[PDB]
Amino acid sequence: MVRILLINSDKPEPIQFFQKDKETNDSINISVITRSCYAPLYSHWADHVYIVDDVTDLTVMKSLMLEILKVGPIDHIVSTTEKSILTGGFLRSYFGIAGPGFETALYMTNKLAMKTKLKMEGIPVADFLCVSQVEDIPAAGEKLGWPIIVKPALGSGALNTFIIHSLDHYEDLYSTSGGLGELKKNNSLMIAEKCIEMEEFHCDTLYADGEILFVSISKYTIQGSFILSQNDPVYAEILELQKSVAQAFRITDGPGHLEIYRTHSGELIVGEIAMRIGGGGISRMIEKKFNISLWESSLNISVYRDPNLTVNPIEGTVGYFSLPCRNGTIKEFTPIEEWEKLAGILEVELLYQEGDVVDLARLYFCLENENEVQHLLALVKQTYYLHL
Amino acid sequence: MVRILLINSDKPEPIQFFQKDKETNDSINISVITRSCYAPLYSHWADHVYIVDDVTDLTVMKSLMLEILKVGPIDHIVSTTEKSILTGGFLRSYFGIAGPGFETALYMTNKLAMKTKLKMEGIPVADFLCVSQVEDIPAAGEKLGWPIIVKPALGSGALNTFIIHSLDHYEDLYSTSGGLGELKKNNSLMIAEKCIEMEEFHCDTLYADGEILFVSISKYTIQGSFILSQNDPVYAEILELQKSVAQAFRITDGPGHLEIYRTHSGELIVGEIAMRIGGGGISRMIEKKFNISLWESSLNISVYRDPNLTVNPIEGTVGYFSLPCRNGTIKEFTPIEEWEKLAGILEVELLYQEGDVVDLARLYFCLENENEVQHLLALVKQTYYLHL
DSSP states (O other): OEEEEEEOSSOHHHHHHHHHHHHHOTTEEEEEEEOGGGGGGTTTTOSEEEEOSOTTOHHHHHHHHHHHHHHOOOSEEEEOSGGGHHHHHHHHHHTTOSSSOHHHHHTTTBHHHHHHHHHHHTOOBOOOEEESOGGGHHHHHHHHOSSEEEEESBSOOTTTOEEEOSHHHHHHHHHSTTTTGGGGGOOSOEEEEEOOOOEEEEEEEEEETTEEEEEEEEEEOOEEEEEOOTTSTTHHHHHHHHHHHHHHTTOOSEEEEEEEEEOTTOOEEEEEEESSOOTTHHHHHHHHHHOOOHHHHHHHHHTTOOOOOOOOOOSSEEEEEEEOOOSSBOOEEOOHHHHHTSTTEEEEEESSOTTOBOOOEEEEEEESSSHHHHHHHHHHHHHOOEEO | OEEEEEEOSSOHHHHHHHHHHHHHOTTEEEEEEEOGGGGGGTTTTOSEEEEOSOTTOHHHHHHHHHHHHHHOOOSEEEEOSHHHHHHHHHHHHHTTOSSOOHHHHHTTTOHHHHHHHHHHHTOOBOOOEEESOGGGHHHHHHHHOSSEEEEESSSOOTTOOEEEOSHHHHHHHHHSSSTTTTGGGOOSOEEEEEOOOOEEEEEEEEEETTEEEEEEEEEEOOEEEEEOOTTSTTHHHHHHHHHHHHHHTTOOSEEEEEEEEEOTTOOEEEEEEESSOOTTTHHHHHHHHHOOOHHHHHHHHHTTOOOOOOOOOOSSEEEEEEOOOOSSBOOEEOOHHHHHHSTTEEEEEESOOSSOBOOOEEEEEEESSHHHHHHHHHHHHHHOOEEO
């Protein structure tokens, strides 16, 4: 019997994969670790469902894992959420299960451990400070200069990232409730650096047995990005940087998302890496360009199966644009017909409909050259509107 | 300001080291994590003493470490106890502190992860089963043959180690109270192996920057050990086995204690390894033979100082014997003079005297050959007696 431990939230992709897998294979046993609000998503098909409110708590996870092992051993641990990456790596190493280990997972979660390893190896990285207190921000803000970026060392700073321009900006974020979000609680590690933004790139990879099965290098542009060519001058430089990070972090199997920055000097520094599949349109941008399924392939790797990576690339420069979505009662936005009129657009993906209480949509395109992209951005930027 | 986090119990060596270091250096800041019963050992000289009930609990240690960092950053973490090895490695990796990492420390604590890593590399290891329940013992006991050894996978399982000869031996350990120790709770991962009487050796090493500064290979036997010669036939293979284990576990800095078993076939298999200095007489046995201090040197390594381990070897085969100690009212034992009469003996170290409420003593010798040892061993049992 193949016992698989799945640590997922509400992401439908791994749910559909293992649900369809159980239907076609009697040997498949699915154990699920998820939140209480996600339990009905697994209750009717999964063999075992364990409810956990906080997956980050390694102590509770170890205790739970022991109880799970009593039912039977685990052959594979599948971590499809960001909060489960470090936990997944911890469980694999501690209980002798094949897959990405703790330290490898630690480098793709803890920015402090990530930046520390890269600086020791020779991989160029932006400076940083360890921040244990919001009261240490003025001290940190003066050491490298204002303004600053303050974000949690673990995970990504979704609603926990703040830009502080001055001391009196901080002291009023300190005074307002809650101007510093959950950071004021001082229960989590933080990292801080001066807001340095230039040209940004991102490299999305798929590893197996230490080798790259697939790699796509794109460039960020309302936001968006577009996939670069292998013949692009910067492609070779980013790819070798990907090689360096992979060797340093000992990457062997799984997905990867590495963000690269280019200084005005032209130096390439490493921003952040993750064991995730590219968020938003990135996953779907790749699927249109190469006609391969990142989810289907990576999940096959996670359970030690042969991934069906048959790369059939379409010609031209493929990318996507995302449209911001403000909270409230959606009254009217740009019609689908108005987008599809624009030449080069492949698909328009709405996330909301007319008359909803709340990206709003994603525009996937296919152009022949990169010059058009900055032109297309202007037209999209032009005809987009959201009234609520 | 050199901030050092010391995680120690009641071992006097690191206490004496950092207490004298603080007296001769005011820049030295000592933070201590220990149990409440060990607090007076640090309260009068250490800068900060933090009381902790369970050092193994990684979640509460992470939370505590954050509070410690608020006082100030940490330059070095010194873990001198067995329960602190994995915790220390976790804290170093998670908080970007130089020293032995999580996985490295995990391989010298978790026998399951140890045995798994060694098997993947090709390094010979005795067979084993994962035991999640004491009720799973009869299944494991029938699978490998009786008798078997059951001990916790984490730590060294002091007084949580049991020899089980039959199924009904298990059922009487199960029915009695205390007979199966703390294992009956089924709250910790356990390991199982056939109890096979074999020759065992132990290799004590000291690492720095991935290189061996010192290495000593000895042989186990009333207990004892004696240091082997570099020209000993088995010395080169055990040393080469040490290289393999170190490479697999990526050992860079700190002490090491590797136990090796030799089968009737003459095969050398890896028993156990630990990030520790050899227990009992081992440290002083080496100290008499090589005139080097494992404690003084390793502690210097832990705080990134140069140890000048200048080996001045005395001639002859040096070793020690330890004498068992029964609980009760000690009335009379073998006098020191009777020991000192025996030619070849270097020092007699008693731990108890006549009229105490409770190893009993350690006899360090210096002989020319291994044959002498078994002559001396015969002599010790002969002239040994303990009445209470």
